[model samples]
Target: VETRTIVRFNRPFLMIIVDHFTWNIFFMSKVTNPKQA
Candidate 1:
């Protein structure tokens, strides 16, 4: 069920994207590479 077939951010997707993707993923780099952090 691929409902969202586009690229954009509003409200709900914005926060979740930031919290998970931006925060975790980017921060994931730190977790995996704390030496860089």
Candidate 2:
């Protein structure tokens, strides 16, 4: 099974990529925390 957690940060999202094999993923955020967004 794959596990993911969304984290917020001040960096802008330039691009996103995903691998179907390993399932290691990353998400872009505009805030520093879940409450801020």
Candidate 3:
């Protein structure tokens, strides 16, 4: 299932989307928990 999806999609776009998604999570965590920053 995963392989078929990747094969059909633009890999770089998928990678960038995931990268920004994770960064947003990390940024929010830092904002909510300044001690961890």
Candidate 4:
């Protein structure tokens, strides 16, 4: 089920994943803060 209806601020997003054989770099954050938890 795919849905979309998000609205309430804190919309910071960042996602990057690469390493399909050593590319490296992997990060994900749909909404990050609070000292990164």
Residue 31 deviation, candidate 3, in Å?
A: 0.3
TM-score for candidate 2: 0.20
Clashing pairs in 4: none
lDDT of 4: 0.67
Residue 28, candidate 1: alpha-carbon lDDT:
24
Sorted by lDDT (best first), the order is: 4, 2, 1, 3
Segments in model 3 whose C-alpha atoms lie over 4 Å from true places: 1-30
Per-residue lDDT for 1-37 in model 3, tens only?
3554335432322122234545543322112223343
TM-score of each: 0.15, 0.20, 0.13, 0.23
Give one digit per residue, the lDDT tens place, for model 1 in 1-37.
6677686433332122236544743322212222343
Candidate 4 — which residues are off by over 4 angstroms?
1-10, 26-37
> Which has the higher TM-score value, candidate number 2 or candidate number 3?
2
Clashing pairs in 1: none
Least accurate 10 contiguous residues by lDDT in model 1: 26-35
